[PDB]
Design a protein around this nucleic acid. Structure first.
Ligand SMILES: [Zn+2]
Lengths: 100, 65, 76, 192, 62, 142, 142, 59
RNA sequence: ACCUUUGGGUUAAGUCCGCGAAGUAGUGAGAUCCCUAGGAUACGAAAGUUAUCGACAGGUGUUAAAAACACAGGAAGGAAGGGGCAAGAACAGGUCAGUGAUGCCCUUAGAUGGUAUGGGCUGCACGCGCACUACAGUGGUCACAGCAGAAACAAAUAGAAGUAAAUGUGAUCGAGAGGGAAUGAGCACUGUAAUGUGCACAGGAACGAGGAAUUGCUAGUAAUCGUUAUCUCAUUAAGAAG
C-alpha cells in the first residue's frame, strides 16, 4: 500500500520541475493526490583565505553547497509501483525508495 | 601502508611486534598538486586551499552570502 | 593603629548608650567609629538584634541593615 | 504576593504627586510612566528625543554599569539601587523619588566654557547650556562621585549612594557633584 | 550670589564654532523688554526656557 | 470539553507557550512553581506588573500554565509576559463579548505595546576582519 | 500527584539531611574531611556534613526525574549536574565535571538500604524512598 | 536616498500620457492598472512606478 | 591637433531637477540572489513545517521642481537590517617556497635528487609588532540550585578530556587569604620514541592601573561571559572562523 519516494538534488530548479511533473502524474491518476514535503536542506560549507600568499588585507570567503530534497508519501498497488518506477530514470536528481 | 616494528621486552630475549599509526602530513598530500600545506580535510576532500578555489565551481560550491 | 578583636566591657557599655537615637546602622559604623574588625562587628550586631535593642530591616544576600530607637518610617 | 493594588516602584513607593520644581527642566524628566521594575527594552535610542522619554530611575541605573568590568550587568545595578532607596526613604523620610528629582535639579551647571572663535584662533568664552544637556551632566556627576568614592574604602556601595543623593537634594557643599557644579560655573564666569 | 534671569528662545540661526558645537539663538526675557542674541551649546528647541547669569553680555554677530 | 486557548510569546531566542483555562479559582504556575515559590524575582515583578494594568476582576475564574525554552534569564521573563498578556485578550474575544476585549487591549496598549507585539531584534552576525559584528582589528602604521 | 514541587528546595535538602544522619543510611568515604568534590574546586567543603547534603540532593534529582517521567539517571549525568568552572592560571576558565567516586559510593549505599534500583541504562527510585519523602512533605508544608 | 531612477520615472511619465483616464487618486487602483498593462517583472519595481504615478496625478 | 560649452539646487551614486548649439539610445550605479524577521486558506494527525504576500517617503506637517526630516500607526518606515556580486584605466605592487602554469641562466652519483637514524628550525647580550592573565572586595572560598545556540557522552572508591559560563540563594574570608612566574621528590596518559599533556604535594617572582605617542566603535552595536559534533588535531589552542 504505502511508498515513500525521496527525490534528492543539489539543484533547485530541476527538483521543482521534476516534483511538479510527478505531482501532475499523481493528480492525473487521482489516488487522492497531494503535494511533496519540502525537507530541511543539507548544507556543507568551507571557509578559506582568498590570497595564495600572506600579502595584503586578509580577506575570507565562505563556499556552501546545498542539497535540496523532497519526499512524497503515497498509496499505490504493487503493479503501479513496478510500472511507475519507469519514470525514475535519466535524472540529475537521485531517487530512493522505502516500503512496508 | 600500515608498517610494523619489532620490539624487545625487558629480558632482551623475547620479541613482540607493534604497528605504526598513520598520522601527520606524510600521507595527506594534496590530490591535485602533492602539496603538504593548507590541505582542506573536511568532507573527505584532500585538496589544498589554492587548488580548491579554482575547482570549487566544478565540484558545485557557491558563495551565496 | 590596627583594628581590634574584642569588645571589652567599657566599649560594650557605651555602645548600648550610643545605639539608641541613631536611625539606620550597619556593619561599617561599629567598625569605623569604634576600632572593631568586620568579623566582630557582625557578632555584636547579631547579638543586639536578639536582645531586641536593635531591629533588622533588610538582609538580602550578605547586605544587612539595622535600625535603632529613633527610626520612623514613611506613612500613607 | 505582597500587594494586589496599583503600580508602585519596587512594589513599595507611591508613584504620584510628583513635582519637578524648575520650569526650565519640565518637559525632559519622565516621572509619568508607571513601571514596577526599573527595566525596559523599549528601543527609543534610535530616535530624535527618544532618550528623554526613558523613565528617571532607568537612566539612573544605566549610569552604574561602568568601570569596564561591569558592562552589561543591569541586574546588579537594580539590586544596588533597590537597597539605596530603602536607606534614603528611611533617612530622608520622603519618597526616594523626590530626593532623586532634587539631586538632578541642583547638580546641573547652568553656564559653561566653549571655543567660539571661527575665522582665526579658537578663543574660549562662556556659553549657556540647553535643558537637555543640563540634566545629562547632572547624572554624569552624581555617578562619577559615587564610583570613585567607593573604590578602596570599607563602606558598602548602597550606603554611599544614600550619602551623596541626600546632600545633593539639599544643595550642600558635602556633595562631590554639587562642588564640581560650582567649579564649572566659576570658570565659565572667569572666561565671561 | 544666585542672580538669574529666565528667557524664552524665539529663533535659532546657525550651527557655529570649531566642530559646529554651538547654536546662535534669539532670546526674549520673561519680565523685561530686552531681547538678546546668544550662543548656546546643548540641543535646543524653540520655546525652551533658559537661565542666564547676565541680561547684557551679547553675541552681536547674530 | 473545558474552555481553553493557547498562545506563543518570543524574545531573542527564547520561546514560551501559555495555556489558559476555565477554573473555580485564579491559579498561575511557571516551571511548575507558583509565584510565591518561584526562585527569580525579576520574572515575578514582570508578572505582577502586567496583572495590575489588567484589572484583577478580569483574571478571575481563570488558570495558567507557562512553559519555555531558549534564550536566558532576563529574555525569558519578557517572553513569558507576552504569552500571558495575549492569553487574556484571546480568551475574552472567544468566550465573552468583544467590547471587553477592546477595553482591556486599550489599557495594555497605553502601558506597553511590547506586551502584545514581539520585538524583531536579534544578534547581528560576525564579519571577518574583526572580533564581532562591527568592531575592527587594530590597524598599525609605524 | 507530583508532590515534590509543593515545597522550596532550600527547605527540603536541609530537612532530609537530618533524617539521613540520625539513621546513618549513607556512610562517609575514607578521608571525606580533606577530599575535594572536584578538580575544579579550590578547597574542601566548609560543612563537615557535605556528604549528607550530596545524599539529600541526589534523592531530589531522582524525585523530579520520576515526576517528569524522564529516562533513568546515569553516573555521567550526575557528574555534569554538579560540575563547575575550573580556575586555570593565565587562561580562560573552563567547565569541569564532579568526581564520580562520591556519587558511586552514595548510590551503592542507597542500593543496600533498598532505596535505589539499578536499571540497564541508569538508576531509579523504589517504594520506600518515595514514601519517606511523601511523609516528610506532609508535615513540612503544615 | 529615495530617488526613483531613470527607467521608473520614464515608465511613469509614459503611462500617464498613454492611459490618463484609467487612473485615479488611489494607490491601489493605480497598482492594479500597472499590474494589468505593464511587462514589469518584480513587485519591487511596480510599487515604485505606481508611487511616482500617484505622486504626479495630484500635481 | 581639440571642445560641445556659463559649473544653479539634490543623492550613497552625472543619483537626479532646472537651462542650453545640441539631441538620441547603452555599460557602470541602480535594478537584478541568497540568508535572518512576520504571514495558512496548503500539508500532517501530530502538536511542526513551509509560504507569488507584506513597506511605497504611502499618510499628516513642512508654500517652484528634485529629495528630506520629525511624528504616527505597523512583524517590518526612508538604500527594512546584514552579507554577496560588482565599470574603464592603472601599478615595472605581491607570489617562480601552490601548481605536470612558464621563458632564460645554474646543478645533476663524491647530487643542489631521494631515504634512514640523530641534531636544528624551539639557541640568547639585546631593540620592535600583535595577543593572554592580572593588579582585587561591583572581590576570594564552601555548598546548593538553574538557563543557550538545542538535542550523541563504556566504566571509574584521592586524582588523573567532555552537555555552558557568567548567573541565583545561603554560608564563609577580610585589605598582597589578590596573583600564580622560576623550581623539587613523585603518580599517570598519548606516542615508534617525551622533549608534549593531565594529576597530587609543595614552592611562592614581577605587577598596587601604565611616558611620548596610538587603534577600532552609532544599537541587540561596543564591552563582558562561556561554548565549539568548526578549522588545524596521535597527543598538543593563549590562533583564526562561527
Ligand atoms: Zn593543491
Amino acid at each position: 500500500i504505502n511508498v515513500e519516494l525521496r527525490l534528492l538534488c543539489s539543484n533547485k530548479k530541476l527538483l521543482s520541475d521534476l516534483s511538479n511533473r510527478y505531482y501532475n502524474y499523481l493528480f492525473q491518476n487521482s489516488p487522492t493526490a497531494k503535494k511533496p514535503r519540502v525537507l530541511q536542506p543539507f548544507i556543507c560549507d568551507v571557509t578559506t583565505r582568498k590570497s595564495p600568499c600572506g600579502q595584503g588585507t586578509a580577506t575570507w570567503s565562505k563556499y556552501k553547497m546545498i542539497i535540496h530534497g523532497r519526499m512524497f508519501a503515497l498509496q499505490m498497488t504493487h503493479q503501479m509501483l513496478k510500472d511507475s518506477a519507469a519514470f525514475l530514470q535519466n535524472t540529475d536528481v537521485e531517487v530512493r525508495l522505502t516500503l512496508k | 601502508m600500515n608498517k610494523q616494528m619489532i620490539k624487545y621486552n625487558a629480558d632482551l630475549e623475547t620479541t613482540f611486534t607493534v604497528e605504526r599509526k598513520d598520522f601527520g602530513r606524510t600521507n595527506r598530500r594534496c590530490r591535485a598538486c602533492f602539496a603538504y600545506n593548507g590541505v582542506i580535510r573536511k568532507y573527505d576532500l584532500m585538496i589544498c586551499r589554492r587548488c580548491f578555489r579554482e575547482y570549487a565551481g566544478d565540484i558545485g560550491f557557491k558563495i551565496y552570502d | 593603629v590596627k583594628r581590634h578583636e574584642r569588645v571589652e566591657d567599657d566599649i560594650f557599655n557605651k555602645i548600648v548608650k550610643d545605639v539608641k537615637n541613631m536611625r539606620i546602622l550597619t556593619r561599617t559604623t561599629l567598625s569605623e567609629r569604634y576600632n572593631l574588625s568586620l568579623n566582630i562587628s557582625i557578632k555584636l550586631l547579631r547579638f543586639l538584634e536578639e536582645n531586641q535593642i536593635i531591629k533588622l530591616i533588610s538582609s538580602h544576600r550578605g547586605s544587612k541593615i539595622y535600625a535603632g530607637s529613633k527610626y520612623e518610617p514613611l506613612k500613607v | 504576593t505582597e500587594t494586589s493594588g496599583d503600580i508602585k516602584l519596587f512594589g513599595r513607593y507611591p508613584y504620584t504627586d510628583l513635582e519637578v520644581k524648575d520650569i526650565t527642566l519640565e518637559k525632559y524628566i519622565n516621572v509619568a510612566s508607571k513601571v514596577i521594575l526599573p527595566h525596559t527594552s523599549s528601543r527609543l535610542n534610535t530616535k530624535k528625543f527618544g532618550r528623554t522619554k526613558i523613565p528617571v530611575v532607568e537612566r539612573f541605573v544605566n549610569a552604574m554599569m561602568r568601570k569596564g568590568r561591569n558592562n552589561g550587568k543591569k541586574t546588579l545595578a537594580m539590586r544596588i539601587v533597590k537597597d539605596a532607596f530603602f536607606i534614603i526613604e528611611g533617612v530622608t523620610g520622603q519618597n526616594p523619588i523626590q530626593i532623586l528629582v532634587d539631586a538632578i535639579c541642583n547638580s546641573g551647571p547652568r553656564e559653561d566654557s566653549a571655543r567660539i572663535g571661527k575665522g582665526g584662533v579658537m578663543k574660549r568664552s562662556s556659553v549657556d547650556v540647553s535643558p537637555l544637556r543640563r540634566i545629562n551632566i547632572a547624572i554624569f556627576l552624581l555617578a562619577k562621585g559615587v564610583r570613585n568614592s567607593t573604590f578602596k574604602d570599607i563602606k558598602m556601595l548602597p550606603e554611599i549612594i544614600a550619602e551623596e543623593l541626600i546632600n545633593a537634594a539639599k544643595n550642600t557643599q558635602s556633595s562631590f557633584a554639587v562642588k564640581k557644579k560650582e567649579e564649572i560655573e566659576r570658570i565659565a564666569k572667569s572666561n565671561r | 550670589s544666585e542672580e538669574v534671569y529666565i528667557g524664552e528662545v524665539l529663533q535659532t540661526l546657525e550651527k557655529t564654532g570649531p566642530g559646529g558645537g554651538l547654536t546662535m539663538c534669539q532670546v526674549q526675557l520673561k519680565d523685561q523688554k530686552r531681547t538678546l542674541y546668544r550662543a548656546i551649546m546643548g540641543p535646543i528647541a524653540v520655546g525652551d526656557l533658559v537661565a542666564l547669569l547676565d541680561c547684557e553680555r551679547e553675541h552681536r554677530r547674530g | 470539553s473545558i474552555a481553553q486557548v493557547i498562545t506563543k510569546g518570543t524574545r531573542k531566542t527564547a520561546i514560551s507557550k501559555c495555556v489558559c483555562s476555565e477554573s473555580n479559582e485564579f491559579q498561575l504556575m511557571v516551571d511548575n512553581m507558583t509565584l510565591d515559590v518561584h526562585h527569580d524575582n525579576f520574572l515575578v515583578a514582570k508578572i505582577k506588573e502586567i496583572m495590575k494594568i489588567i484589572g484583577y476582576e478580569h483574571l478571575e475564574n481563570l488558570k495558567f500554565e507557562l512553559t519555555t525554552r531558549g534564550g536566558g534569564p532576563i529574555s525569558r521573563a519578557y517572553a513569558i509576559r507576552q504569552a500571558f498578556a495575549k492569553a487574556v485578550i484571546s480568551y475574552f474575544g472567544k468566550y465573552y463579548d468583544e467590547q471587553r476585549k477592546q477595553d482591556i487591549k486599550e489599557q495594555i496598549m497605553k502601558f506597553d505595546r511590547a506586551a502584545l507585539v514581539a520585538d524583531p531584534r536579534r544578534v547581528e552576525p560576525k564579519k571577518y576582519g574583526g572580533p564581532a559584528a562591527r568592531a575592527k582589528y587594530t590597524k598599525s602604521y609605524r | 500527584n507530583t508532590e515534590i514541587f509543593k515545597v522550596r528546595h532550600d527547605t527540603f535538602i536541609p530537612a532530609l539531611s537530618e533524617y539521613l544522619r540520625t539513621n546513618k543510611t549513607v556512610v562517609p568515604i575514607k578521608n571525606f574531611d580533606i577530599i575535594k568534590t572536584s578538580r575544579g574546586k579550590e578547597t574542601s567543603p566548609l560543612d563537615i556534613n557535605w556528604y549528607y547534603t550530596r545524599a539529600a540532593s541526589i534523592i531530589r534529582k531522582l524525585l523530579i526525574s520520576k515526576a517528569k517521567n524522564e529516562k533513568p539517571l546515569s553516573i555521567v549525568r550526575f557528574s555534569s549536574e554538579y560540575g563547575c568552572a575550573k580556575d586555570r592560571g593565565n587562561r580562560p576558565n573552563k567547565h569541569v565535571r564532579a568526581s564520580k567516586g562520591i556519587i558511586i559510593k552514595i548510590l551503592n549505599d542507597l542500593q543496600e538500604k533498598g532505596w535505589v534500583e539499578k536499571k540497564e541504562n541508569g538508576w531509579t527510585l523504589k517504594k520506600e524512598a518515595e514514601e519517606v519523602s511523601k511523609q516528610l512533605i506532609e508535615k513540612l508544608i503544615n | 536616498g529615495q530617488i526613483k531612477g531613470k527607467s521608473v520615472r520614464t515608465a511613469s511619465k509614459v503611462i500617464v500620457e498613454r492611459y490618463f483616464n484609467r487612473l485615479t487618486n488611489d494607490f491601489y487602483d493605480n497598482r492594479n492598472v500597472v499590474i494589468d498593462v505593464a511587462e514589469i517583472r518584480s513587485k519591487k519595481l511596480r510599487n515604485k512606478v505606481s508611487g511616482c504615478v500617484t505622486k504626479l496625478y495630484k500635481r
